[PDB]
Write a protein that binds this DNA or RNA. Sequence first.
RNA 1: AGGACCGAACCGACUAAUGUUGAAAAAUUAGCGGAUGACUUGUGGCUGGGGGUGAAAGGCCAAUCAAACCGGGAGAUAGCU
RNA 2: GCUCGCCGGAAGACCAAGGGUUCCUGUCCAACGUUAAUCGGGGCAGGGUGAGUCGACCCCUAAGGCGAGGCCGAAAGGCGUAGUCGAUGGGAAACAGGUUAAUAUUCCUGUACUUGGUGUUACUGCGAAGGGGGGACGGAGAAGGCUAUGUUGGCCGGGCGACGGUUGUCCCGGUUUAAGCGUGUAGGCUGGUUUUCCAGGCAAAUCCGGAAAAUCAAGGCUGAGGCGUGAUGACGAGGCACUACGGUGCUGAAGCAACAAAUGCCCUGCUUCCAGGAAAAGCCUCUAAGCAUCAGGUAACAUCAAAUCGUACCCCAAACCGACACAGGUGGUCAGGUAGAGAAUACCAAGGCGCUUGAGAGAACUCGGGUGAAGGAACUAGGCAAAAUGGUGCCGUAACUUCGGGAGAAGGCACGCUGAUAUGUAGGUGAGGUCCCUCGCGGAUGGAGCUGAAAUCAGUCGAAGAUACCAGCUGGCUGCAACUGUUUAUUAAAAACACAGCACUGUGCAAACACGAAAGUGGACGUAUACGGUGUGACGCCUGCCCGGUGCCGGAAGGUUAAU
Lengths: 9, 271, 93, 46
Amino acid sequence: AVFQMRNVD
Amino acid sequence: AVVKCKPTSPGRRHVVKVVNPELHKGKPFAPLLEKNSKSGGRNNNGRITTRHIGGGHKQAYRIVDFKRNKDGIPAVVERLEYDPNRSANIALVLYKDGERRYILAPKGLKAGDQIQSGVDAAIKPGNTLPMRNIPVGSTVHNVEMKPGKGGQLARSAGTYVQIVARDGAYVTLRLRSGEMRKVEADCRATLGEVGNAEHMLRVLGKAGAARWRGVRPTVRGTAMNPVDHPHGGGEGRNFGKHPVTPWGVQTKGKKTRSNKRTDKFIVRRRS
Amino acid sequence: MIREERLLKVLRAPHVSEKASTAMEKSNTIVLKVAKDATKAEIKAAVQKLFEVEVEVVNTLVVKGKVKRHGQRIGRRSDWKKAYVTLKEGQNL
Amino acid sequence: MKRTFQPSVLKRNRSHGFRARMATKNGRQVLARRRAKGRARLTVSK
RNA sequence: AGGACCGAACCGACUAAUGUUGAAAAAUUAGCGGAUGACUUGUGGCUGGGGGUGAAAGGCCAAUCAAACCGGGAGAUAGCU
RNA sequence: GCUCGCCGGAAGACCAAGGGUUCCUGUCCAACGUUAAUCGGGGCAGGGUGAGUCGACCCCUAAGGCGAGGCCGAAAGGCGUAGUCGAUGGGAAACAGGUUAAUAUUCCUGUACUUGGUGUUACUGCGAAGGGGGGACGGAGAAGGCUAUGUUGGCCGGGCGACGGUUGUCCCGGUUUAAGCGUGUAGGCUGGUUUUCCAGGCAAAUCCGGAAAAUCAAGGCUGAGGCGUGAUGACGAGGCACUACGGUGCUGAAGCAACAAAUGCCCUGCUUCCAGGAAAAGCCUCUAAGCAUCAGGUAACAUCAAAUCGUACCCCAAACCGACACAGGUGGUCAGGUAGAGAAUACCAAGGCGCUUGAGAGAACUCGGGUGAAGGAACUAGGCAAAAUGGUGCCGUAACUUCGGGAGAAGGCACGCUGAUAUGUAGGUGAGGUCCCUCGCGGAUGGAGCUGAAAUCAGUCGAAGAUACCAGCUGGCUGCAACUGUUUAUUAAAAACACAGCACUGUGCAAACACGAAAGUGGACGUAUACGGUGUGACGCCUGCCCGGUGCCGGAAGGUUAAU
């Protein structure tokens, strides 16, 4: 599945 | 005689049908029918050379007698018929020998009319005779561009072409566009004008109305992306860029014409 | 047609089975394997001469060879064509 | 969910059959490479 | 009469729970939208990689797409770990 | 083996796709099965797929592919004519019963049918790659006439009830039969026959079409279904009999009527509406080049041939597609009883299953549910989730509006059972009797029988009668988009996209534009009331000003300027 998303802290 | 539709449910309120009661309902004169399969707007390469074309109801092509080669023989109308391919109505005239051919219908046409092609033919609407016999200023349609080629001019409904001049072998013609253009007098032409002048009145009235016409939805380029169309991006509609075709040719204010060979026939630009 | 030499190879081997015996003791239809090709007529004539008995009607079918396997290696058998030669009142052997 | 693989022998022979390989020189080169490599199955069928 | 109404098949996937090394690499359950049409679907073709297609999300093109996959140039380059 | 439980518009059955012996039997338990396993879709072995008329092959053609020459391109190659291939289409013909452990429209039994070869006889103008006809087609809607099928009655066979009754207005079961053939009805379509003439259908024409006459009014085509035949039978509940207790032989009663009735048939109809609805062959006819006592053509009989290939099993799944015996995905066909509007839903028939780990204990906690006293959003980012509303008939219903809406607005009443009206009414269906008939599958008269709601009155039971399943929450202000749709398959269904409409601009046809070095196509077998591009986004009121900068059009003297 791994997915994606992002890490905008 | 157009009749505005009553507002029963949305997509019906704005519809304006153009009924034509004198048309003969029923199956088409079968032998002259022939197949006309939809192209989808694609060519032999399979690329979409022309966008916004596809789908729609199937249509069957019908041969029409452009040349009107049967001079001298009297003709009589049998019945009017609808033509899916064209704005103008077609008509099934009966030649005295029993041969039948479709012809574009003049506004003055009615059932039983005695139209007759020929050089010696009397000047009444529905006749198809060479322009050399035609008096100046008479309404004219279905004009041949070449001697006996057919009659590509004024095929559309409500169109008419006045002949304002006859000097030389040529006769000058006034196109419906308003552009002037010389045409050889030897070319055949039909007197009067086609009667479907109500054709402009239709307004479709729904989003799905274009679907059977083979028309496909139009996506504006500003809503697209820079990679797909020169317009696009800008975060929130915007515009900025000078308007252009997707291939980059300048839209609005650029004559694409480049023939030169036919400039001699162009007496004047359209106004 | 005959051309005896072509017909002689048609009858390569009888195919005995428990069902075939019931076919013979009741339906009087002898059962045997035939050539991979051939036809309904040659199979008939082959019984008309060498079996010296009249044929009522001939039937044909092809039984696919069941696949076998041993380890990663596999081995299909071979296809063969069963035939049902119905005999008249003149049947013998 | 529907799988990407939706088998049909008729499309299969037409798309990847020996005749398709013979349809053009580029397909014949494929067979030439499969032969040079050595293979039990030059194509696929029955 | 209707891109008309309620509502199964059929199609679609708005909410919420469960699931999160699941029964399932996106489902199930309880509701939902459309359901004579711009409908859905079977079968068989067409458009081939800076190209295709797109009622336009830069989405999709065999579970991968701000440029598919396979092989080759190729042991590319890397002042970096 | 005896019971329970689930589906039953399927979790039953069938075909295609696809799989490829998983099918049947014997035997085996290492490995395969999320457990043991004598079992299995597992190992081994044997057996199993029977076609003139099911399908493919075959004839024909669509979108297309290929393509003699040809056109074009550095080469490879691309395009394309005549042609050829291409079904998801069209084109000749088998139905019932029986049988096997597994195959049956295939074998057997019974009754049949089509197209050709050959022969006999009779009559006679036969003959294309050509002409014409036919094949040959849309959406929606309206009924009517019927069948599949069901209920009830009658008939026949069987049963007097484990517990108070049950020889009667009782209970149970059966009441099944095709293609073919004869008959040509309910209907639908069209005025027929004959003579003469013609610039048409590339050649010709007796055919089609056109034009003049004459004559006559029913001439023909199409067509379900019914009724006969097929059928002295077949099937058949149930018995008589041997019995490897898994069955096999024989015999075998009644086999009708009435009503209801479809999504199936008549219907490729009819009516109606624009969006005006493939292609060719087989088929019916026409002659030409030709044969013309022939060959051929048509008809009755007889005979022969109908090959090759598929045929087992799975078919919404354990076997196809998902790495799995995986809660997913997979097209068409068959459509029982009761209630109901219904293919919804509940309970059942036929039939298939209890889903390949179980036995216990009855902690939290978690998941799936039921109920809860008092309060009723005090919870929370937020009425999220649950709860609630829910049917038919009738009363009645506002602001606003493009006068169609809003609207099922909102808000209420009635709803079970039984009797009477009427021992079953209004209606529907329809036999006998009677009469008329150019006499048929006729019509009128006549009304039995069957079927059958809805209403009123009265009575009656429960806390509750649309009692279960099934089955809208409603109103008010306002933002946005006109609306129906479409969109990030796999976190965003939206105000985003589309949209009809409006406007601008390009384009006179060998069009602009677009694919492609080209050739050739698309646009379009269209012709400015058309087409392309751009912007805007129904409708109503409208849409002001600025050409300095930027872009573009128009203008041709001068300034400037390339190759030469």
